[PDB]
Amino acid sequence: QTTKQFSKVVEDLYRYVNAATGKPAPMISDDVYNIVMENKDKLNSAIVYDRDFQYSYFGFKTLERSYLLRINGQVAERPQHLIMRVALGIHGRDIEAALETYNLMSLKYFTHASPTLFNAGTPKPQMSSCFLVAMKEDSIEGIYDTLKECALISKTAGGIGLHIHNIRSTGSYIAGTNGTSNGLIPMIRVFNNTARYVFALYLEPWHADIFDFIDIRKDLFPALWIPDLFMKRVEENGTWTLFSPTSAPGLSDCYGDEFEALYTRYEKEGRGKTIKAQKLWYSILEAQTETGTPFVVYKDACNRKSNQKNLGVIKSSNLCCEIVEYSAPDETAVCNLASVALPAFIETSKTSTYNFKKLHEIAKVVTRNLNRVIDRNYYPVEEARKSNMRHRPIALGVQGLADTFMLLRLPFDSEEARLLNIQIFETIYHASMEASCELAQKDGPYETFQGSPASQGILQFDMWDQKPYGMWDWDTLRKDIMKHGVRNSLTMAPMPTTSQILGYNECFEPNPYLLRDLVDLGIWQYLITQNGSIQGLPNVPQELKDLYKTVWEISQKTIINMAADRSVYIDQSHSLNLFLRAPTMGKLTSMHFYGWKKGLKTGMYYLRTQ
Amino acid sequence: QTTKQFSKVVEDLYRYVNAATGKPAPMISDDVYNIVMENKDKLNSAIVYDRDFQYSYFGFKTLERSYLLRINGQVAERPQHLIMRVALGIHGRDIEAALETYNLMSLKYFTHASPTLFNAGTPKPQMSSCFLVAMKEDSIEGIYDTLKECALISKTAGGIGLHIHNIRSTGSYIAGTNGTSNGLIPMIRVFNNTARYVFALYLEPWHADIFDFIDIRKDLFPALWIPDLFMKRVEENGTWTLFSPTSAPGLSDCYGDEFEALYTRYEKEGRGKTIKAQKLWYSILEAQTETGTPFVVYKDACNRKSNQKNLGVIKSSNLCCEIVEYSAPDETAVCNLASVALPAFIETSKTSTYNFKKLHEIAKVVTRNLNRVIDRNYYPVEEARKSNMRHRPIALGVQGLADTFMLLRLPFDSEEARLLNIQIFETIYHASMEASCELAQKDGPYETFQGSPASQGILQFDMWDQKPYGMWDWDTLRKDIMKHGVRNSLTMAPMPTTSQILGYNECFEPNPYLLRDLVDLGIWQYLITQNGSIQGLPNVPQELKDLYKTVWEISQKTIINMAADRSVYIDQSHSLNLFLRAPTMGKLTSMHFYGWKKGLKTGMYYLRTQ
Numbered sequence A, B: 001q002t003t004k005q006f007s008k009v010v011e012d013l014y015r016y017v018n019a020a021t022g023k024p025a026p027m028i029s030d031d032v033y034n035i036v037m038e039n040k041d042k043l044n045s046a047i048v049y050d051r052d053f054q055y056s057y058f059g060f061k062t063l064e065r066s067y068l069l070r071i072n073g074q075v076a077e078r079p080q081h082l083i084m085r086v087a088l089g090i091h092g093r094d095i096e097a098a099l100e101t102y103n104l105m106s107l108k109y110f111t112h113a114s115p116t117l118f119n120a121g122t123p124k125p126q127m128s129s130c131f132l133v134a135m136k137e138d139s140i141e142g143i144y145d146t147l148k149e150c151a152l153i154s155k156t157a158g159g160i161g162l163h164i165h166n167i168r169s170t171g172s173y174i175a176g177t178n179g180t181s182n183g184l185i186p187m188i189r190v191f192n193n194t195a196r197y198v199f200a201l202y203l204e205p206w207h208a209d210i211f212d213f214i215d216i217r218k219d220l221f222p223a224l225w226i227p228d229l230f231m232k233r234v235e236e237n238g239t240w241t242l243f244s245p246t247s248a249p250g251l252s253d254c255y256g257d258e259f260e261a262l263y264t265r266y267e268k269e270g271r272g273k274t275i276k277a278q279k280l281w282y283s284i285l286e287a288q289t290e291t292g293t294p295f296v297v298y299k300d301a302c303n304r305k306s307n308q309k310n311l312g313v314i315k316s317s318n319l320c321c322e323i324v325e326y327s328a329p330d331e332t333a334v335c336n337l338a339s340v341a342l343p344a345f346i347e348t349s350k351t352s353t354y355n356f357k358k359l360h361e362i363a364k365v366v367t368r369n370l371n372r373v374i375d376r377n378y379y380p381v382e383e384a385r386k387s388n389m390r391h392r393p394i395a396l397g398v399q400g401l402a403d404t405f406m407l408l409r410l411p412f413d414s415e416e417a418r419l420l421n422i423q424i425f426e427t428i429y430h431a432s433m434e435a436s437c438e439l440a441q442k443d444g445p446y447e448t449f450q451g452s453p454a455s456q457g458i459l460q461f462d463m464w465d466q467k468p469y470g471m472w473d474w475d476t477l478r479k480d481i482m483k484h485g486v487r488n489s490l491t492m493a494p495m496p497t498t499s500q501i502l503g504y505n506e507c508f509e510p511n512p513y514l515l516r517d518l519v520d521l522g523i524w525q526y527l528i529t530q531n532g533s534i535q536g537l538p539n540v541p542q543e544l545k546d547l548y549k550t551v552w553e554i555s556q557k558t559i560i561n562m563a564a565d566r567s568v569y570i571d572q573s574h575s576l577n578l579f580l581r582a583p584t585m586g587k588l589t590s591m592h593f594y595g596w597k598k599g600l601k602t603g604m605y606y607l608r609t610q
């Protein structure tokens, strides 16, 4: 039902005309069309079409419905065509690199984020996953400049984090009108309507519109950017002060002890309205219980622990709370994502082993890829191009961590899983910093490298004051970095995940593996009825009950521990979903404080409840 | 309850501090504060406070609730203070002119529009009534540039006309996304939401989103910008074609025979969807019957008959449909309004007479005033400053035409009213062109004067191919204009009307006069019950029944005739409200065609129904 020869499919996509209007509407960039034609025989023959059968039914259907390019509503592209299109869009004239990427992706060692699959090699190749936007100014002009920026970004793929800390709250004076402002909520309604026409919102809990903000969902997502001081006041059952940004300037522009001093001074001066810390705390947990939101990200852990700290104060994260990157009125941070497929590295050796050397190597390939994406990307707005070109941050993720544990017969909560978790992330961090250091030797370091923690030999685990696990040699890597720099300000931000296309469990959270096991025990409607849980089931061995636990069945304390463990290797943050069976204000509270005290940057992304 | 000395009130307003914030918030401009202080004795003594009693209870309460400046929620200003503030804000250092304006307004010979009363002499002296905005481009960028412009305008006083003819309709192709647009309605929702956060919409009936557009109200107001060709196709029961602007470029950029040729050619080429003219006609009348809208303004009469025709094609009117002024992406036309109080010129001479010589003189005073307003105005956006400074259009209105007829014992539909109507408007047009010509001798003509109909000796009544009534000498005026120019591209746009402050009937449509008459006949609850109509009432003389008819009782054909009569003296348009007792599709249709055939620019503003 589809043309086989790749160059021919490229021809059709390139020559496409919209019949209804008579308008030529090429679906491939000139740049990539030319490259294919000059490389025709090399490219057509490199492709192995049997690999289209490496997809699950769910996997292929996802690709078919969305990703495979279509002509007149008919799918033109085979999966292998998409992969090669993507490889070429990323690598351009470097055919050797394109073929390597083609092979590794086609054999499913790694994949690239959705926007890359959609747009790579097309005329508006917008390959990036999200954008972190700063509210430009607290004025109608700045608000409408920001709104326009967001409309333009919305024309492309990708989500938007937007921090609003600087907008004056309800009842704040307006010199112009001698009137008072109606605050954040009606401004948010403007942004929501613009999103519909063509979104994660970030706010610090001292903002005087906070109680309304967190109730937004009772589609924009509220996320709290939480200073440590708030959590201390809550713990101690103390007071908390709400300020309009205009009566307490600069709070979002400092963190840690500098913030606490400035904040405490503003409290003393009677610049705001004082309440009981736990009053707001209670409202937050109430909103989370009912809506899944607000998200929780710890502003102080994010800033103290960022290799971008030399740029200034980081004011937000993104929709999925994995991205921690600097943003300002003239700079919109960009998310460039790809994920390694963790099970691809499992090897027989009767026992199964994990090949860390090969994971290291694939992680280095993806790192180089994401750097090419930065350079070949189509930027929807100038703020985003400026940001990416200056600090060149990337975000490597993973998928199939759960799958990996299961294939290797490791219960998620086991000592063996705990160790593998740590090893996998040390490897990927080391690999990506090694590849990035190599690129710095070739192309130079990123523009802002000098004065960064990494230039001083401080890597991520150093900022957690921990020693690395030591599977790789960090001292040599660190010597090289201090000498040559790295090409990327940041490297890792394991994300939500593309994971359904590769047929693996969405990462990084906890069934063909279970099924194969029931087959081998001959047992072969419970799971439907009991929702995929095998505990409390009479005929199944303890070993399967231990291996096959459901995320509702796994201790959130273990999830939080494992996240704390891998976080020493993570430049950015990562999405922590939390699952509560029988949600209680007390249990939620302790989940938050536990993650907080572990030093987590992202305390919670979504709260999923029974 | 209020300080008497004007300079002292000015002092208080100037020195005002917002207590809650500790912020100085002066309510008078530096410029005007200084002028008052240097003129202190002259200004304080010029004021006559007995004149505060010249207001009706309804009149004064309107002023008090809104216009009189307040300090801490307390009214600081007496009406006389407001009038002098306004006089000074308009005239600046010209004290002689300020005193003349002070006297005439305080004796109620004329007034200025609401924004002028509000803001004259304050720090952001935005004295203009509305703004005619062009949609910048048919793109997300142009749409959001326009949205920002409108938000900024919305911070000040004044309404917005916005013409959207250039935005592509539902199902139109978008090269960028290979998708299709959702057209005007969701774009309009964006503008509506922006209006709420911080509106008349203009569309030609060939636009393919037209059926949804006219149903908008079934607060933004749809108004039709109607070519003659539409009305002919309707009359003849012919076809009508709907185009997306993108499939039929340029239709809004020509009018008259040029339009008909281009339109007919696009029809022949099958660029659109053909329907029956009366299908759309029917939907329009249905919308008007139920909502009062869409408004009807005739695009060809507006353009063929405009002294601004040398600028390009006029694409819209304003909210009240009196303003006909050129607008483009870089130029936002501005409405500068003031109204003459028509009854002030009634004089005893047992009979009452009308003093046309004094009306002439007051009309010249207001003309000079409105020119000062142009120069001293605070412009919210640069497009508006550019427009006003280049073409310097003004709009003189009237109020109390109905009052005038009644004081003089003239039934509205009488031959005597018909003549007075014509004389009053000839006088005001002549006066304003005489004053404007005087200013051109002093300051030069407006920048675009050369090549205009007026530079060729073509005045408004010439473009109706009529001879003026001849109460004033037009030949001398016309000779002077061709020689010296005029300072203003346009002069008259009688508006909605400020008419409740002066205690006169809202103009120009059809009771102390009735009451005084019942008193004199000794008759002294009917009117409540019967809604102010004296017909069908046994004890009242025919002469009163004839004089005191209610607008529901007056022939709309007479209203339309009288409007056609005064329209030869009107540079711009004027608001024609229509009243239907027992509304029928047939009667509405004939009302439209009758006005259309009379050559009216504004066919209908609001339709008011039983």
Ligand SMILES: O=[N+]([O-])c1ccc2c(ccn2[C@H]2C[C@H](O)[C@@H](COP(=O)(O)OP(=O)(O)OP(=O)(O)O)O2)c1
Residues within 6 Å of the ligand: A138, A139, A140, A141, A143, A167, A168, A173, A174, A175, A176, A177, A181, A182, A183, B154, B155, B156, B197, B198
């Ligand atoms: O003028 N308005 O009609 C107006 C002005 C400001 C308004 C709103 C509705 C909301 N705001 C918010 C938007 C900003 O958060 C803040 C200040 O906006 P601004 O600076 O543009 O307002 P100005 O009237 O120009 O006052 P300022 O000059 O002190 O800031 O007020 C309306």
Ligand SMILES: O=[N+]([O-])c1ccc2c(ccn2[C@H]2C[C@H](O)[C@@H](COP(=O)(O)OP(=O)(O)OP(=O)(O)O)O2)c1
Residues within 6 Å of the ligand: A154, A155, A156, A197, A198, B138, B139, B140, B141, B143, B167, B168, B173, B174, B175, B176, B177, B181, B182, B183
């Ligand atoms: O890209 N989008 O997601 C997008 C693009 C345009 C959109 C909408 C929703 C409405 N429109 C309207 C707004 C304009 O009336 C018209 C074209 O807008 P544009 O030029 O900005 O769109 P492009 O995708 O840049 O296509 P173009 O380059 O042919 O105009 O389409 C969404």
Ligand SMILES: [Mg+2]
Residues within 6 Å of the ligand: A138, A139
């Ligand atoms: Mg400001």
Ligand SMILES: [Mg+2]
Residues within 6 Å of the ligand: B138, B139
């Ligand atoms: Mg375009």
